[PDB]
Coordinates of C-alpha atoms and ligand atoms in Angstrom, one line a residue:
Chain L
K1 CA 161.2 -10.7 129.9
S2 CA 163.6 -9.9 127.1
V3 CA 166.0 -7.0 126.6
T4 CA 169.1 -5.9 124.5
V5 CA 172.1 -4.2 126.1
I6 CA 174.5 -2.4 123.7
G7 CA 177.7 -1.2 125.4
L8 CA 179.5 -3.4 127.9
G9 CA 181.5 -1.2 130.1
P10 CA 181.1 -1.6 133.9
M11 CA 177.6 -0.1 133.9
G12 CA 176.4 -2.2 130.9
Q13 CA 177.9 -5.3 132.5
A14 CA 176.1 -4.6 135.9
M15 CA 172.8 -4.1 134.2
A16 CA 173.1 -7.1 132.0
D17 CA 173.9 -9.2 135.1
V18 CA 170.9 -8.0 137.2
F19 CA 168.6 -8.7 134.2
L20 CA 170.1 -12.3 133.9
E21 CA 169.6 -12.6 137.8
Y22 CA 165.9 -11.8 137.4
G23 CA 165.2 -14.1 134.6
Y24 CA 165.4 -12.0 131.5
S25 CA 166.6 -13.2 128.2
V26 CA 169.5 -10.7 127.5
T27 CA 171.0 -10.1 124.0
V28 CA 174.3 -8.1 124.0
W29 CA 176.7 -6.5 121.6
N30 CA 180.0 -4.5 122.1
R31 CA 182.6 -3.3 119.4
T32 CA 185.1 -5.4 121.4
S33 CA 183.3 -8.7 121.4
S34 CA 185.4 -10.3 124.3
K35 CA 184.0 -7.9 126.8
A36 CA 180.9 -10.1 126.9
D37 CA 182.7 -13.4 127.8
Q38 CA 181.6 -13.4 131.5
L39 CA 178.0 -12.6 130.6
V40 CA 177.9 -15.3 127.9
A41 CA 179.1 -17.8 130.6
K42 CA 176.1 -16.6 132.7
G43 CA 173.5 -17.1 129.9
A44 CA 173.6 -13.8 127.9
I45 CA 173.3 -14.2 124.1
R46 CA 176.1 -12.4 122.3
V47 CA 175.5 -11.4 118.8
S48 CA 178.0 -10.4 116.2
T49 CA 176.4 -7.3 114.7
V50 CA 174.5 -4.2 115.8
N51 CA 171.8 -5.3 113.3
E52 CA 171.3 -8.5 115.2
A53 CA 171.2 -6.7 118.5
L54 CA 168.5 -4.3 117.3
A55 CA 166.5 -7.1 115.8
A56 CA 166.4 -9.2 119.0
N57 CA 164.2 -6.9 121.1
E58 CA 162.0 -3.8 121.2
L59 CA 163.8 -2.4 124.2
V60 CA 167.4 -1.6 123.7
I61 CA 169.6 -0.2 126.6
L62 CA 172.4 2.0 125.3
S63 CA 175.2 2.1 128.0
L64 CA 177.7 3.7 125.8
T65 CA 180.5 6.1 126.6
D66 CA 178.9 9.1 125.0
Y67 CA 176.2 10.1 122.5
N68 CA 178.7 10.2 119.6
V69 CA 179.1 6.5 119.9
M70 CA 175.3 6.1 119.4
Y71 CA 175.5 7.9 116.1
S72 CA 178.6 6.1 115.0
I73 CA 177.0 2.7 115.5
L74 CA 173.4 3.5 114.5
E75 CA 173.7 5.9 111.6
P76 CA 174.9 3.2 109.2
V77 CA 171.9 1.1 110.1
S78 CA 169.4 4.0 110.2
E79 CA 166.9 1.8 108.2
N80 CA 166.6 -0.7 111.0
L81 CA 165.3 1.5 113.8
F82 CA 161.5 1.5 113.4
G83 CA 159.7 0.4 116.4
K84 CA 162.7 0.2 118.7
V85 CA 162.8 1.9 122.1
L86 CA 166.3 3.2 122.8
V87 CA 167.1 4.0 126.5
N88 CA 170.2 6.2 126.4
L89 CA 172.3 6.4 129.6
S90 CA 175.3 8.3 128.4
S91 CA 176.1 11.4 130.8
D92 CA 175.8 14.4 128.7
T93 CA 174.1 17.7 128.3
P94 CA 170.3 18.3 127.9
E95 CA 170.7 19.5 124.3
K96 CA 172.7 16.3 123.3
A97 CA 169.9 14.2 124.6
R98 CA 167.3 16.3 122.8
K99 CA 169.2 16.1 119.5
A100 CA 169.4 12.3 119.8
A101 CA 165.8 11.9 120.5
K102 CA 164.8 13.9 117.4
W103 CA 167.3 12.0 115.2
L104 CA 165.9 8.7 116.5
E105 CA 162.3 9.8 115.9
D106 CA 163.1 10.7 112.4
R107 CA 164.0 7.1 111.8
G108 CA 160.9 5.7 113.5
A109 CA 162.3 4.9 116.9
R110 CA 161.4 6.2 120.4
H111 CA 164.0 7.5 123.0
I112 CA 164.0 7.4 126.8
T113 CA 166.7 9.4 128.4
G114 CA 168.2 8.1 131.7
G115 CA 170.5 9.8 134.2
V116 CA 171.7 7.0 136.5
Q117 CA 172.5 8.4 140.0
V118 CA 174.7 5.4 141.2
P119 CA 177.8 3.5 140.2
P120 CA 177.6 -0.1 138.9
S121 CA 177.3 -1.5 142.4
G122 CA 174.1 0.3 143.0
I123 CA 172.3 -1.5 140.1
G124 CA 169.7 -3.9 141.3
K125 CA 169.1 -2.0 144.6
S126 CA 165.7 -0.3 145.1
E127 CA 167.3 2.6 147.1
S128 CA 169.2 3.6 143.9
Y129 CA 167.4 6.1 141.6
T130 CA 167.6 7.0 137.9
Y131 CA 166.2 10.1 136.3
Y132 CA 164.1 9.4 133.2
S133 CA 162.6 11.6 130.6
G134 CA 160.9 11.4 127.3
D135 CA 157.4 10.5 126.1
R136 CA 155.4 9.4 129.1
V137 CA 153.5 6.6 127.3
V138 CA 156.8 5.1 126.0
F139 CA 158.3 5.3 129.5
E140 CA 155.2 3.8 131.2
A141 CA 155.4 0.9 128.7
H142 CA 158.9 0.0 129.8
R143 CA 158.9 1.1 133.4
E144 CA 158.7 -2.4 134.8
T145 CA 161.8 -3.5 133.0
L146 CA 163.7 -0.4 133.9
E147 CA 162.8 -0.7 137.6
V148 CA 164.6 -4.1 137.7
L149 CA 167.7 -2.0 137.6
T150 CA 166.8 0.9 140.0
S151 CA 163.9 2.9 141.3
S152 CA 162.8 5.4 138.7
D153 CA 162.2 9.2 138.9
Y154 CA 160.3 10.3 135.8
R155 CA 160.9 14.1 135.3
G156 CA 158.8 14.9 132.2
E157 CA 158.4 14.8 128.4
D158 CA 161.5 16.7 127.3
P159 CA 164.2 14.2 126.6
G160 CA 166.7 16.8 128.0
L161 CA 165.3 16.8 131.6
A162 CA 166.9 13.6 132.8
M163 CA 170.3 15.1 132.1
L164 CA 169.1 18.6 133.3
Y165 CA 168.3 17.4 136.9
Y166 CA 171.5 15.3 137.0
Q167 CA 173.9 18.1 135.8
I168 CA 172.4 20.9 138.0
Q169 CA 172.8 18.7 141.0
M170 CA 176.5 18.1 140.1
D171 CA 177.0 21.8 139.7
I172 CA 176.1 22.2 143.4
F173 CA 178.0 19.0 144.4
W174 CA 181.4 20.0 142.9
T175 CA 181.3 23.7 143.7
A176 CA 180.2 23.2 147.3
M177 CA 182.7 20.3 147.9
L178 CA 185.5 22.4 146.6
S179 CA 184.4 25.2 148.9
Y180 CA 184.7 22.7 151.7
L181 CA 188.2 21.8 150.7
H182 CA 189.1 25.5 150.3
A183 CA 187.7 26.3 153.8
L184 CA 189.6 23.3 155.2
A185 CA 192.8 24.6 153.7
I186 CA 192.4 27.9 155.5
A187 CA 191.6 25.9 158.7
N188 CA 194.7 23.8 158.4
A189 CA 196.8 27.0 157.8
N190 CA 195.5 28.2 161.1
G191 CA 196.2 25.0 163.0
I192 CA 192.8 23.3 162.9
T193 CA 192.2 19.8 161.6
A194 CA 189.4 18.2 159.5
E195 CA 188.2 16.4 162.6
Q196 CA 187.9 19.7 164.5
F197 CA 186.1 21.3 161.4
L198 CA 183.7 18.4 160.8
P199 CA 180.8 19.3 163.0
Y200 CA 180.9 23.0 161.7
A201 CA 181.2 22.1 158.0
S202 CA 178.4 19.6 158.4
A203 CA 176.1 22.0 160.3
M204 CA 176.6 24.6 157.6
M205 CA 175.8 22.2 154.8
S206 CA 172.8 20.9 156.5
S207 CA 171.5 24.5 157.1
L208 CA 171.5 25.3 153.4
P209 CA 168.1 23.6 152.5
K210 CA 166.4 26.1 154.9
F211 CA 167.8 29.0 152.9
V212 CA 166.8 27.4 149.6
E213 CA 163.3 26.8 151.0
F214 CA 163.0 30.4 152.2
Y215 CA 164.1 31.9 148.9
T216 CA 162.4 29.5 146.5
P217 CA 159.0 31.3 146.3
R218 CA 160.6 34.7 145.9
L219 CA 162.9 33.5 143.2
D220 CA 159.8 32.0 141.3
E221 CA 158.1 35.5 141.6
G222 CA 161.2 37.2 140.2
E223 CA 161.3 39.1 143.6
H224 CA 164.6 40.1 145.2
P225 CA 163.6 42.6 148.0
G226 CA 166.2 43.5 150.5
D227 CA 164.0 42.8 153.5
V228 CA 166.1 40.1 155.1
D229 CA 169.4 40.7 153.4
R230 CA 171.1 43.2 151.1
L231 CA 173.7 42.5 148.4
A232 CA 176.0 45.3 149.6
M233 CA 176.3 43.5 153.0
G234 CA 176.8 40.1 151.2
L235 CA 179.7 41.7 149.3
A236 CA 181.3 43.0 152.4
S237 CA 181.0 39.5 153.9
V238 CA 182.6 37.9 150.8
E239 CA 185.4 40.4 151.1
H240 CA 186.3 39.2 154.6
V241 CA 186.5 35.6 153.2
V242 CA 188.8 36.7 150.4
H243 CA 191.1 38.6 152.9
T244 CA 191.1 35.6 155.3
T245 CA 192.1 33.3 152.4
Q246 CA 195.0 35.8 151.4
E247 CA 196.2 36.1 155.0
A248 CA 196.4 32.3 155.3
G249 CA 198.4 32.0 152.0
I250 CA 195.6 29.9 150.4
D251 CA 194.8 30.0 146.6
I252 CA 192.3 32.8 146.0
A253 CA 190.8 31.7 142.7
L254 CA 187.5 30.2 144.1
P255 CA 186.6 33.0 146.5
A256 CA 187.8 35.6 144.1
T257 CA 185.3 34.3 141.5
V258 CA 182.5 34.5 144.2
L259 CA 183.6 38.1 144.9
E260 CA 183.5 39.0 141.2
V261 CA 180.0 37.7 140.9
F262 CA 178.9 39.9 143.8
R263 CA 180.7 42.9 142.3
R264 CA 179.0 42.4 139.0
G265 CA 175.7 42.4 140.7
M266 CA 176.6 45.6 142.6
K267 CA 177.7 47.2 139.3
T268 CA 174.3 46.5 137.7
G269 CA 172.4 48.3 140.3
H270 CA 171.5 45.7 143.0
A271 CA 173.0 47.2 146.2
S272 CA 169.7 47.2 148.0
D273 CA 168.3 44.0 146.7
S274 CA 168.6 40.4 148.1
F275 CA 171.8 38.5 147.1
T276 CA 169.3 36.3 145.1
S277 CA 169.4 39.1 142.5
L278 CA 172.8 37.6 141.4
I279 CA 170.7 35.2 139.4
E280 CA 170.5 38.0 136.9
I281 CA 174.2 38.0 136.5
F282 CA 174.2 34.2 135.9
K283 CA 171.1 34.5 133.5
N284 CA 173.7 36.5 131.6
Chain V
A1 CA 178.3 36.8 196.6
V2 CA 178.8 34.9 193.3
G3 CA 177.7 36.1 189.8
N4 CA 178.5 38.7 187.3
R5 CA 177.8 42.4 187.8
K6 CA 174.5 43.2 186.2
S7 CA 176.1 46.2 184.4
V8 CA 177.4 46.3 180.9
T9 CA 178.4 48.8 178.2
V10 CA 177.5 48.3 174.5
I11 CA 179.4 50.4 171.9
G12 CA 177.9 50.2 168.4
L13 CA 174.2 50.4 167.8
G14 CA 173.7 48.9 164.4
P15 CA 170.9 46.3 164.2
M16 CA 173.1 43.7 166.1
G17 CA 174.2 46.1 168.9
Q18 CA 170.6 47.3 169.2
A19 CA 169.4 43.7 169.6
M20 CA 172.1 42.9 172.2
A21 CA 171.3 46.0 174.2
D22 CA 167.6 45.2 174.1
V23 CA 168.1 41.7 175.3
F24 CA 170.4 42.9 178.1
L25 CA 167.8 45.4 179.3
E26 CA 165.0 42.9 179.2
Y27 CA 167.1 40.5 181.3
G28 CA 167.7 43.1 184.0
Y29 CA 171.1 44.6 183.3
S30 CA 172.0 48.3 183.7
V31 CA 173.0 49.0 180.0
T32 CA 175.1 52.0 179.1
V33 CA 175.3 52.6 175.3
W34 CA 177.3 54.9 172.9
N35 CA 177.0 55.2 169.2
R36 CA 178.5 57.6 166.6
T37 CA 174.9 58.3 165.4
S38 CA 173.4 59.0 168.9
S39 CA 169.8 59.0 167.7
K40 CA 169.9 55.3 167.1
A41 CA 169.7 54.7 170.8
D42 CA 166.2 56.5 171.1
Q43 CA 164.1 53.4 171.4
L44 CA 166.6 51.8 173.8
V45 CA 166.7 55.0 176.0
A46 CA 162.8 54.8 176.1
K47 CA 163.2 51.3 177.6
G48 CA 165.8 52.3 180.1
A49 CA 169.2 52.3 178.4
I50 CA 171.6 55.0 179.5
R51 CA 173.0 56.9 176.6
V52 CA 176.3 58.6 177.2
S53 CA 177.7 61.3 175.0
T54 CA 181.3 60.2 174.5
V55 CA 183.3 56.9 174.1
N56 CA 185.3 57.9 177.1
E57 CA 182.1 57.9 179.3
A58 CA 181.1 54.6 177.8
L59 CA 184.4 53.0 178.8
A60 CA 184.2 54.6 182.3
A61 CA 180.7 53.2 183.0
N62 CA 181.7 49.5 183.2
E63 CA 184.4 46.8 183.3
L64 CA 182.7 44.7 180.5
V65 CA 182.4 46.5 177.2
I66 CA 180.7 44.8 174.2
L67 CA 181.6 46.1 170.7
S68 CA 179.4 45.5 167.7
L69 CA 181.0 47.6 165.0
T70 CA 181.5 47.2 161.3
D71 CA 185.1 45.8 161.5
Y72 CA 188.3 46.2 163.5
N73 CA 189.4 49.4 161.7
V74 CA 186.4 51.1 163.3
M75 CA 187.5 49.9 166.7
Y76 CA 190.9 51.6 166.2
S77 CA 189.3 54.7 164.9
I78 CA 187.2 55.1 168.1
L79 CA 189.6 53.7 170.7
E80 CA 192.9 55.0 169.7
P81 CA 192.1 58.6 170.9
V82 CA 191.1 57.2 174.3
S83 CA 194.0 54.6 174.6
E84 CA 194.7 55.9 178.1
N85 CA 191.3 54.8 179.5
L86 CA 191.4 51.1 178.4
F87 CA 193.3 50.0 181.4
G88 CA 191.4 47.3 183.3
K89 CA 188.6 46.9 180.8
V90 CA 187.4 43.6 179.2
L91 CA 186.4 44.3 175.5
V92 CA 184.3 41.6 173.8
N93 CA 184.5 42.3 170.1
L94 CA 181.6 40.8 168.2
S95 CA 182.7 42.5 164.9
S96 CA 183.2 40.4 161.7
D97 CA 186.8 40.5 160.4
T98 CA 189.8 38.2 159.7
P99 CA 191.7 36.1 162.1
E100 CA 194.8 38.1 161.8
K101 CA 192.9 41.4 162.5
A102 CA 191.6 39.8 165.6
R103 CA 195.0 38.7 166.7
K104 CA 196.6 42.1 166.1
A105 CA 193.7 43.9 168.0
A106 CA 194.1 41.5 171.0
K107 CA 197.8 42.5 171.3
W108 CA 197.1 46.2 170.8
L109 CA 194.6 46.1 173.6
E110 CA 196.8 44.1 175.9
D111 CA 199.5 46.7 175.4
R112 CA 197.0 49.3 176.8
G113 CA 196.1 47.1 179.7
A114 CA 192.8 45.8 178.5
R115 CA 191.7 42.2 177.9
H116 CA 190.1 41.0 174.6
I117 CA 187.6 38.3 173.8
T118 CA 186.8 37.6 170.1
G119 CA 183.3 36.7 169.2
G120 CA 181.8 35.4 165.9
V121 CA 178.1 35.7 166.1
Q122 CA 176.3 33.0 164.0
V123 CA 172.9 34.6 163.8
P124 CA 171.1 37.7 162.7
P125 CA 169.6 40.3 165.2
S126 CA 166.5 38.2 165.6
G127 CA 168.5 35.3 166.9
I128 CA 169.9 37.3 169.8
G129 CA 168.5 36.2 173.1
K130 CA 167.7 32.7 171.9
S131 CA 169.6 29.8 173.4
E132 CA 169.6 27.8 170.1
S133 CA 171.8 30.6 168.7
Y134 CA 175.6 30.2 169.0
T135 CA 178.6 32.5 169.0
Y136 CA 182.2 31.3 168.6
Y137 CA 184.5 32.7 171.2
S138 CA 188.2 32.8 171.6
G139 CA 190.9 34.4 173.7
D140 CA 192.2 34.0 177.2
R141 CA 190.2 31.2 178.9
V142 CA 190.2 32.8 182.3
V143 CA 188.8 36.1 181.0
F144 CA 186.2 34.3 179.0
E145 CA 185.1 32.2 182.0
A146 CA 184.8 35.3 184.2
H147 CA 182.3 36.9 181.7
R148 CA 180.6 33.8 180.2
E149 CA 177.4 34.2 182.2
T150 CA 176.9 37.7 180.7
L151 CA 177.8 36.5 177.2
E152 CA 175.3 33.7 177.5
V153 CA 172.5 36.2 177.9
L154 CA 173.0 36.9 174.2
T155 CA 173.4 33.4 172.8
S156 CA 174.9 30.1 173.7
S157 CA 178.6 30.1 173.6
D158 CA 181.2 27.9 171.8
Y159 CA 184.6 28.6 173.2
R160 CA 187.2 27.5 170.5
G161 CA 190.5 28.1 172.3
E162 CA 193.2 30.6 173.4
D163 CA 194.2 32.1 170.1
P164 CA 192.1 35.3 169.6
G165 CA 191.9 34.6 165.8
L166 CA 190.0 31.3 166.2
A167 CA 186.6 32.8 166.7
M168 CA 187.0 34.7 163.4
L169 CA 188.6 31.5 161.8
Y170 CA 185.6 29.4 162.4
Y171 CA 183.2 32.1 161.4
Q172 CA 185.0 32.9 158.1
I173 CA 185.5 29.3 157.0
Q174 CA 181.8 28.6 157.5
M175 CA 181.0 31.7 155.4
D176 CA 183.4 30.5 152.6
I177 CA 181.2 27.4 152.3
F178 CA 177.9 29.4 152.7
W179 CA 178.5 31.9 150.0
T180 CA 180.2 29.6 147.6
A181 CA 177.5 26.9 147.9
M182 CA 174.6 29.3 147.8
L183 CA 176.0 30.9 144.6
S184 CA 176.2 27.4 143.1
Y185 CA 172.6 26.9 143.9
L186 CA 171.7 30.2 142.1
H187 CA 174.0 29.2 139.1
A188 CA 172.3 25.7 138.9
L189 CA 168.9 27.4 139.2
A190 CA 169.7 29.7 136.3
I191 CA 170.5 26.7 134.1
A192 CA 167.2 25.1 135.3
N193 CA 165.2 28.2 134.5
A194 CA 166.8 28.5 131.0
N195 CA 165.6 24.9 130.4
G196 CA 162.0 25.7 131.5
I197 CA 162.0 24.5 135.1
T198 CA 161.3 26.6 138.2
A199 CA 162.8 26.9 141.7
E200 CA 159.8 25.0 143.1
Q201 CA 160.5 22.1 140.8
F202 CA 164.2 22.2 141.6
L203 CA 163.7 22.5 145.4
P204 CA 163.6 18.9 146.5
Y205 CA 166.7 18.0 144.4
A206 CA 168.8 21.0 145.4
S207 CA 167.8 20.3 149.1
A208 CA 168.6 16.5 148.8
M209 CA 172.0 17.3 147.3
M210 CA 172.9 19.8 150.0
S211 CA 171.7 17.5 152.7
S212 CA 173.9 14.6 151.3
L213 CA 177.1 16.6 151.6
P214 CA 177.9 16.0 155.3
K215 CA 178.1 12.2 154.5
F216 CA 180.9 13.0 152.1
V217 CA 182.6 15.3 154.5
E218 CA 182.4 12.6 157.2
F219 CA 183.8 9.9 154.8
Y220 CA 186.7 12.0 153.8
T221 CA 187.6 13.7 157.0
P222 CA 189.9 10.9 158.4
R223 CA 191.8 10.7 155.1
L224 CA 192.3 14.3 154.9
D225 CA 193.8 14.4 158.4
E226 CA 196.3 11.8 157.3
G227 CA 197.2 13.7 154.1
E228 CA 195.9 10.7 152.1
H229 CA 194.1 10.9 148.7
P230 CA 194.0 7.4 147.4
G231 CA 191.8 6.8 144.4
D232 CA 190.1 3.8 145.8
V233 CA 186.6 5.2 145.8
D234 CA 186.9 8.1 143.3
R235 CA 189.4 9.4 140.8
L236 CA 190.2 13.0 139.8
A237 CA 190.1 12.2 136.1
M238 CA 186.5 11.1 136.4
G239 CA 185.6 14.2 138.5
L240 CA 187.1 16.4 135.8
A241 CA 184.9 14.7 133.2
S242 CA 181.8 15.3 135.4
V243 CA 182.9 19.1 135.7
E244 CA 183.3 19.3 132.0
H245 CA 179.7 18.2 131.4
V246 CA 178.5 20.8 133.9
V247 CA 180.5 23.5 132.0
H248 CA 179.0 22.4 128.7
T249 CA 175.5 22.3 130.1
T250 CA 176.0 25.9 131.4
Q251 CA 177.2 27.1 128.0
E252 CA 174.3 25.4 126.1
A253 CA 171.9 27.2 128.4
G254 CA 173.6 30.5 127.8
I255 CA 174.4 30.9 131.5
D256 CA 177.5 32.7 132.8
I257 CA 180.4 30.3 133.0
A258 CA 182.7 32.1 135.5
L259 CA 181.8 29.9 138.5
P260 CA 182.0 26.4 137.0
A261 CA 185.0 27.5 134.8
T262 CA 186.9 28.2 138.0
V263 CA 185.9 24.9 139.4
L264 CA 187.2 23.3 136.2
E265 CA 190.5 25.2 136.4
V266 CA 191.1 23.8 139.9
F267 CA 190.5 20.3 138.6
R268 CA 192.8 20.9 135.6
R269 CA 195.5 22.2 138.0
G270 CA 195.3 19.0 140.0
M271 CA 195.5 16.9 136.8
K272 CA 198.5 18.9 135.7
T273 CA 200.4 18.2 139.0
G274 CA 199.8 14.5 138.8
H275 CA 196.7 13.6 140.6
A276 CA 194.6 11.9 137.8
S277 CA 194.4 8.7 139.7
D278 CA 194.1 10.1 143.2
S279 CA 190.8 11.2 145.0
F280 CA 189.4 14.6 144.1
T281 CA 190.4 15.5 147.7
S282 CA 193.9 15.9 146.3
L283 CA 192.7 19.3 145.1
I284 CA 193.3 20.5 148.7
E285 CA 196.9 20.5 147.6
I286 CA 196.1 23.0 144.9
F287 CA 194.4 25.3 147.5
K288 CA 197.5 24.9 149.6
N289 CA 199.9 26.0 146.8
Ligands
NAP1 N1 173.5 42.1 160.9 C1 173.8 40.8 160.8 O1 172.9 40.0 160.5 C2 175.0 40.2 161.4 C3 175.2 38.8 161.7 C4 176.4 38.4 162.3 C5 177.4 39.3 162.5 N2 177.3 40.6 162.1 C6 178.3 41.6 162.3 O2 178.0 42.5 163.4 C7 178.8 43.7 163.1 C8 177.9 44.9 163.3 O3 176.9 44.9 162.2 P1 175.5 45.6 162.2 O4 174.6 44.9 161.2 O5 174.8 45.6 163.5 O6 175.7 47.1 161.8 P2 176.7 48.0 161.0 O7 175.8 48.8 160.1 O8 177.9 47.3 160.6 O9 177.1 49.1 162.1 C9 177.8 48.7 163.2 C10 178.2 49.9 164.0 O10 179.5 50.4 163.6 C11 179.4 51.8 163.6 N3 180.4 52.4 162.7 C12 180.6 52.0 161.4 N4 181.6 52.7 160.9 C13 182.0 53.6 161.9 C14 183.0 54.6 162.1 N5 183.7 54.8 161.0 N6 183.2 55.2 163.2 C15 182.4 54.9 164.3 N7 181.5 54.0 164.2 C16 181.3 53.3 163.1 C17 178.0 52.1 163.3 O11 177.8 53.5 163.7 P3 176.5 54.3 163.1 O12 175.3 53.6 163.7 O13 176.8 55.7 163.5 O14 176.5 54.0 161.6 C18 177.3 51.1 164.1 O15 177.3 51.5 165.4 C19 179.4 43.5 161.7 O16 180.8 43.3 161.8 C20 178.5 42.5 161.1 O17 179.2 41.7 160.0 C21 176.1 41.0 161.6

C-alpha cells in the first residue's frame, strides 16, 4: 500500500488524505511545496523534486490542473519514466488524453485516464464513480488502489474514452440546464414562479430517457423514418417556442440556435424524416 | 338531471381531431364534425359521426365546440366569416400556439359572445382517451368546470388558472426544454459516434444524466424564487471552464459547434456582466435581458 500523488490542489489533497486514512504510504510533490504542509502533518512524505516523487512508487496519480502541466514537469525528466504507471485526472478532451498516453508510452511508461465524476468531498465514498480508460491489464493491476478513492467504471482501451464519456454527459448537462433557465425566464415573464414550474420541468426531464431509449436502436441502424414524427412538424413546434420567447421579451439566442439546426436539416432534404436526422447536421 | 349533454362538435380533423372524435363516439357522444378536407371524416362517418358541410352548421349543432387546428390564424380564417353565429358557444381550442395568441383569441371570441378555454394537449393521437394523459387548461374557471366532464373523456385535465395564455405558457416552456435537451443528446451522440462509440453504448449514460437533472432543478428552485445566485456550491467561472472543454471536444471530433458555442456565449455574457463568483443560475439574468 504505497502511492505517489503529484499535484496538491483540492482534489490531490482529498485523495492523498483518503490514502493516508486507509493506511497507504503516500509520497507527494507540488511546485509550491507549502501546499503539502497539512498532509505532511498527517504522515505524507513530501519530496523536493519530481525525480524523487517518480522514484518512490510504480503508481503515480497526476491531479494536475491540465495536461500541459504534465509535459512541463515530465518532459525534462523523460529518462526516468520507465515502468511507471501515470493516472491522469486532468479534465480535458479525448485527443489530449490520447496524445499524452502515446508520449508516455514512448518513454516506457503506461497511462490510465481518469474522469472523476465528483468534487473533492466525494473522494473516499463508494457511491462516487470515476471513468477509467487505457490498457485493461494495466488498469486491472491498479484497480484495488484506485477503488480506495471511488468506485470505478472502466470504459475501454482507448485512453480518450474516460474523457469522452465525461464530456458528452456535460454537453447534455449544460445545454439542458440552460434550457431550464431559459424556460423559467419565459415563465417568470408570464407571472409563474420556479416553485409552480418545478413539477412540470421535472416531469419533462424525467421523460427524456424514454425518448432516448426509443430512438437508440434506430440511430444505431442509421434509420430516421418519419413513422412517429416528422422534422417539418418539429420545426413548426420550435417556431412556436421562438415566438413565445420573443413575445415574453426573453433572449432568443438559445432557441434561435435550435431553430437554425432544424432549418439546416430541412434545407438538406429531411422534411419527411424523423428529427433524429438532425444528427447528420451535427456530423457536419 | 345532472351531467353534460352527450353532444359535441369537433372542428379540425387532422390526426388529433380524428382521435378526439373517435374517443367521443366510442364513449357514446353524438359527434358532429367539419373539416376543410371533408373526406378525412370518412372513417368517422362509418362509425357514426355526423359530417356537416359548412362551419356554420358545425357551430349550430352544439354549444360545446372543440377545435383542433394547426394554429390560431386558422381559427380566424374559418370563424371570422361566421362571426355572427358564435354567440352562446363554448370554444375549447386545443391548437398549439403562443400565450399571447391565445389571449388575443379569447378576447376576440368574448367580443362575439362566445366563451374560450385554452388547452395544451401533452400527448400524441394515441394518448387520447387514456387517463394517464394530461392536457393543460386555462381560461374562465366557471366555463371550464361546466365542461370538465366532457374534456375528461379525452384526457385528464390540469387546470392552470384564469389567464387564457397559461395553458400555452406551460405547454411551450416544456417544449423549450424538450427540443433543446433532445438536440443536446443528438449533439453529444454525434461526438460519441465520431469517437467510435454507438448510441447503445451511450444509452445508460445519457439516461442517467437526464434523470439526474430534476435533483438540480429541485435544489435551485427556492434560490431562483428569491432571486439569489450565491456561489456557495458552484461558481460560473468553473462552469465556463467546463463548457469550454465541451466546445474543444466538439471541435476535435469535427462536430458542428453551433449549439455548444451558443451555450458558451451565454456563459461569457454572464462573466462579462460580473457573475464569475455567482452560481451559474445567474445566467437567468442574461435570459431576462
Ligand atoms: N399530432 C400531434 O402529435 C400533436 C400533439 C399535441 C398537440 N398537437 C397540436 O394539435 C393541433 C392539430 O394538429 P394535427 O396533427 O391533428 O393536424 P394538422 O395537420 O395541424 O391539421 C389540423 C387541422 O387544421 C386544419 N387546417 C390547417 N390549415 C387550415 C386552413 N388554412 N383552413 C382551414 N383548416 C385548416 C386541417 O385541415 P385539413 O385536414 O383540411 O388539412 C386540419 O383539420 C396542432 O396545433 C398540433 O401542434 C399535435
